[PDB]
Amino acid sequence: PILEFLEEWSMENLEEISPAAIADATKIFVNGCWVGIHKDPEQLMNTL
Amino acid sequence: RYEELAESVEEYVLDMLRDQLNRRQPIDNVSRNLLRLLTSTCGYKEVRLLAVQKLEMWLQNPKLTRPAQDLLMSVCMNCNTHGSEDMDVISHLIKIRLKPKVLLNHFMLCIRELLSAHKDNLGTTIKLVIFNELSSARNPNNMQVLYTALQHSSELAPKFLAMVFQDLLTNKDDYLRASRALLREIIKQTKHEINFQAFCLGLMQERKEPQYLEMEFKERFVVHITDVLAVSMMLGITAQVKEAGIAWDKGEKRNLEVLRSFQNQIAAIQRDAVWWLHTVVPSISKLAPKDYVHCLHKVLFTEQPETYYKWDNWPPESDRNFFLRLCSEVPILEDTLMRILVIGLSRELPLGPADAMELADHLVKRAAAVQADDVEVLKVGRTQLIDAVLNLCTYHNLAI
Amino acid sequence: KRHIDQLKEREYNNYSWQDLVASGVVEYIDTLEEETVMLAMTPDDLQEK
Numbered sequence A: 001p002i003l004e005f006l007e008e009w010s011m012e013n014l015e016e017i018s019p020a021a022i023a024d025a026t027k028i029f030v031n032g033c034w035v036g037i038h039k040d041p042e043q044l045m046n047t048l
Numbered sequence B: 001r002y003e004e005l006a007e008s009v010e011e012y013v014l015d016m017l018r019d020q021l022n023r024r025q026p027i028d029n030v031s032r033n034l035l036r037l038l039t040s041t042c043g044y045k046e047v048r049l050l051a052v053q054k055l056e057m058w059l060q061n062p063k064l065t066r067p068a069q070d071l072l073m074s075v076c077m078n079c080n081t082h083g084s085e086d087m088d089v090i091s092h093l094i095k096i097r098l099k100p101k102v103l104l105n106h107f108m109l110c111i112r113e114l115l116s117a118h119k120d121n122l123g124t125t126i127k128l129v130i131f132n133e134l135s136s137a138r139n140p141n142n143m144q145v146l147y148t149a150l151q152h153s154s155e156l157a158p159k160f161l162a163m164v165f166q167d168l169l170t171n172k173d174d175y176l177r178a179s180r181a182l183l184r185e186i187i188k189q190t191k192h193e194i195n196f197q198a199f200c201l202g203l204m205q206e207r208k209e210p211q212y213l214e215m216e217f218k219e220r221f222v223v224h225i226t227d228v229l230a231v232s233m234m235l236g237i238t239a240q241v242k243e244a245g246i247a248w249d250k251g252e253k254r255n256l257e258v259l260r261s262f263q264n265q266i267a268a269i270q271r272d273a274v275w276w277l278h279t280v281v282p283s284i285s286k287l288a289p290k291d292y293v294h295c296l297h298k299v300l301f302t303e304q305p306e307t308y309y310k311w312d313n314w315p316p317e318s319d320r321n322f323f324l325r326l327c328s329e330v331p332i333l334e335d336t337l338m339r340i341l342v343i344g345l346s347r348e349l350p351l352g353p354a355d356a357m358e359l360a361d362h363l364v365k366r367a368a369a370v371q372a373d374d375v376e377v378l379k380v381g382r383t384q385l386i387d388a389v390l391n392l393c394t395y396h397n398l399a400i
Numbered sequence C: 001k002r003h004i005d006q007l008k009e010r011e012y013n014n015y016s017w018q019d020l021v022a023s024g025v026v027e028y029i030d031t032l033e034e035e036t037v038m039l040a041m042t043p044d045d046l047q048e049k
Helices: A002-008 B006-022 B032-040 B045-060 B062-078 B084-095 B101-117 B120-134 B142-152 B156-170 B176-190 B196-204 B218-235 B239-249 B256-284 B289-299 B305-309 B317-328 B334-345 B353-368 B384-392 C002-008 C017-023
Strands: A026-030 A033-038
Touching (some): A002 A026, B045 B062, B045 B084, B062 B101, B084 B120, B120 B156, B120 B176, B142 B176, B176 B218, B239 B256, B239 B317, B256 B334, B334 B384
Antiparallel strands (some): A026 A033
């Protein structure tokens, strides 16, 4: 359910995302494993 | 200007409305222009449902507070058809939850508008709110929503609430404790601004639907109705009424009017309950003589205190004596007296003449114990009460 | 102060610590999250201005 909620939200899985434009975004992990990155770390931390 | 093109216009609007709402957007990407368009297009139940689906997060977004409030009030004022879409919109609205005080006040005004939109909105909202309260999805706004509904309709809201309690009691499971706590807390938040007499009348009204007419615990339902009536009788006492009773016990004539009006309501409710027992209760079901006498003792508050609290233990031990004394000390009515005598003389009604006359004696003594110059505690115009009393002693010319 | 009012009248409201969790005043904290959150020792004494 967490995976589905993030996928619905503005999260981009690592395979699609451009490797270059990656420093700016904040990485997100679930149970250790890396799922993807998000441009704005805010507005989702408080939402969660 | 588009009477001939109404269907095409509605479908065409809904097309792009669905497109825009379905497009995956971040919260900040929502446009106040889009919110205004939705507000203007709320005339359609589909638009009002799509809006209420995500209205909670739109309100939570501070940047969209005013347009979202406008959308909410437009939805409320356009929700006047009481359709299935309207019911779903009400369900979504009650699911919504609002933290801010100002937002809560605006929501309450919008709920007033929604109730005014259609008459059945009141009953539907009460039913949904009480269902939510019974379920585990309690909304911290349910109590104040019901408070505002009662304010809007001080009588029809109690009536709907009473029928819903009847539907809960008819339900197979024993909702006695939950209903008692529910009404207790509801009264607590509403600060007792509820017409207890009107609510009791709503509970008293017979139900004609096959679900009630085929209920296989009719006797249990009647018993539970009596129990909840006694609980409402208890709750009728406020802190102010407690103070007035204390003052009367001490002989002080301070705020006696509150106590007198309360006792008048109590007596009227007791008369209504006696009328119901006499007329409708036999029609609904044929209770055993012991159960019928027990219910009569309860409604007249001549029953043992233990049975009152044996279920939920409420009220606490301290409050029981005071509440019982206060409710027992009430005036009597000629209608109550004549109904008691008629029931006693009624062979078909399982009440012996001796028991009926003994109960009448006890109640008359209790009313006389309410000696008050300013209150017509004992007022009877008909002299046929004497004849009925004398007949009650007739032996079956010899009398016991 | 409202919540404690209902809580103190237990065994009648069926009011539960789980219901408190639902009300969202209290929450579970693990050590990882504790690492990056300030703590107020005594609300009666610390948070007060």
